[PDB]
């Protein structure tokens, strides 16, 4: 059965990528799902009963008109809100390279768990301010990824002003990602200026925790402001809700929040362990 989940993910990822460049990505996504078999199993029959949670899989489920998790994906991390509330407020911000961006500011205090494939974190934030990030993971790059996503997601001014180039990031249909993803891709390419301008702070030596400096060196006395690494590990309750999906394969809940998009589907591709026919 775990072979089925693994091959279902590879199939959904290939189908979502191909649909994104079609003249009707939604109509093409559906006809491909209905035309693909996994180990002799109709893909639609698996999609109707398999509970594997993965960005591409749920985009397919949304296109099939089925319920998916209420959590949203950003930077590959599943964001599950555990406390607080926010109202979105349009703001024009100025990047460090003197360009304007109209972002939807999450105005409110909120607490999230971020569940990545290789990292987990607890995030507390206010309006355009990160309050606390406790992150765990098994290598540096995995923890850096979580920190970057949280800094970008916080929408802090220091993060906007750490941009050092024009933002021209596009999807596979040759088209500009929304402003949040413009910032994310920029710092995923290089986060040195972000880290160096974020700020550090003295920390209290607490058991099982350690600070992390801008160069991603551990330290016992200082740490990136609000950030701590838990060597013990952060340990993660999914509600399946009705969603909409548009011609760009952007999935939204019934209050307009984008939960998923092709740009949130991993570029990774393993090798299917069961044969996949795209008949």
């Amino acid at each position, epitope marked *: 059965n775990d072979d089925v989940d693994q091959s279902l993910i590879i199939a959904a990822r290939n189908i979502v990528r191909r649909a994104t460049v079609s003249t009707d990505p939604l109509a093409s996504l559906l006809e491909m799902c209905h035309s693909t078999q996994i180990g002799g199993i109709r893909m639609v029959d698996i999609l109707r009963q398999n509970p594997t949670e993965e960005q591409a899989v749920d985009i397919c489920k949304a296109a099939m008109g089925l319920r998916i998790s209420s959590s949203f994906s950003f930077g590959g991390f599943t964001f599950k809100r555990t406390s607080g509330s926010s109202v979105k407020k349009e703001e024009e911000v100025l990047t460090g390279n003197l360009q304007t961006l109209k972002i939807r500011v999450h105005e409110g205090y909120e607490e999230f768990t971020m569940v990545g494939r290789r990292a987990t974190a607890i995030l507390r934030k206010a309006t355009r301010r990160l309050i606390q990030l406790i992150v765990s993971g*098994r290598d540096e790059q995995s923890i850096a990824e979580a920190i970057i996503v949280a800094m970008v997601f916080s929408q802090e001014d220091c993060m906007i002003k750490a941009v050092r180039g024009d933002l021209n990031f596009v999807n596979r249909a040759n088209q500009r990602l929304n402003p949040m993803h413009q910032l994310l891709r920029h710092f995923q390419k290089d986060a040195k200026v972000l880290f160096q301008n974020w700020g550090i702070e003295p920390i209290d030596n607490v058991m099982g925790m350690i600070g992390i400096l801008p160069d991603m060196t551990p330290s016992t006395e200082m740490s990136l402001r609000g950030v701590r*690494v838990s060597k013990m590990g952060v340990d993660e309750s999914t509600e399946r809700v009705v969603v909409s999906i548009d011609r760009f394969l952007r999935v939204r809940d019934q209050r307009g929040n984008v939960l998923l998009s092709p740009e949130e589907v991993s570029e990774t591709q*393993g090798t299917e362990r069961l044969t996949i026919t795209y008949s």
Partner: nanobody, 117 residues
């Protein structure tokens, strides 16, 4: 003075096998998770596997699952990585580390594994 010293790396052909060893000294090996972390040419250090204190639970990155086995000898204080069906993309320096999460408490120096025809 914690000490970790890897050995057993070297040159092998695709599909071959290697047995990496890591000699630990200067701490009570028995009371710590141990891990392997690798760095391919031109890339960053990437977690490979972890093993709990008595070796009854193992953890693997999905790229090595079914091909590598992590193991430990708590009497001799040695960690091992038994590599079967090696691929070109397994080429990397392989580091023995103390602990289960980043930042690991201590790192070995690494031994070079080169899988090439």
């Amino acid at each position: 003075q914690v000490q970790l010293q890897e050995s057993g790396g070297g040159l092998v052909q695709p599909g071959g096998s290697l047995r990496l060893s890591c000699a630990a000294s200067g701490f009570t090996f028995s009371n710590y998770y141990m891990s392997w972390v690798r760095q391919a040419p031109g890339e960053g250090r990437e977690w490979v596997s972890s093993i709990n204190r008595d070796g009854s639970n193992t953890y693997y990155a999905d790229s090595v699952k079914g091909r590598f086995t992590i193991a430990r000898d708590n009497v001799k204080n040695t960690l091992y990585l038994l590599m079967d069906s090696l691929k070109s993309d397994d080429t990397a320096v392989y580091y023995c580390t103390k602990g289960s999460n980043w930042p690991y408490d201590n790192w070995g120096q690494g031994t070079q594994v080169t899988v090439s025809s």
